[PDB]
Amino acid sequence: LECHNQQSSQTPTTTGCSGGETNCYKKRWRDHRGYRTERGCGCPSVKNGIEINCCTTDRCNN
């Protein structure tokens, strides 16, 4: 599986994930005047005001 890993609304970049990994993710939260966005391999558990989208196809976490 390969996933995007760029931040914010940056031009897209991709990374390969560890063998068994089935998900890519996009986390979003707010800070002062805007959103923050984090993208990578996996689907880490979130809490306390973070939202996350997880998907299961290559480069899906746009």
Structure tokens at 36: 């923050």
List the single partner that 48 binds among a copy of itself, Cu ion, Na ion, none, CB under 5 to 8 Å by kind: Cu ion
Q: How many CB atoms lie within 10 A of CB 30?
A: 11
56 binds, among Na ion, a copy of itself, Cl ion, none (CB under 5 to 8 A by kind): none
**How near is the Cβ of 17 to a copy of itself at its closest, in Å?**
11
Q: Which residue has the tokens 């196809």?
A: 57
Q: Where are the alpha helices (DSSP H) in 6-60?
A: none
We find the least distance from the C-beta atom of residue 1 to Cl ion, in angstroms, to be: 13
Task: Look up tokens 């998907």; give the residue.
Answer: 55
Range 15-54, binding a copy of itself (CB under 8 A): 29, 31, 36, 38, 40, 44-45
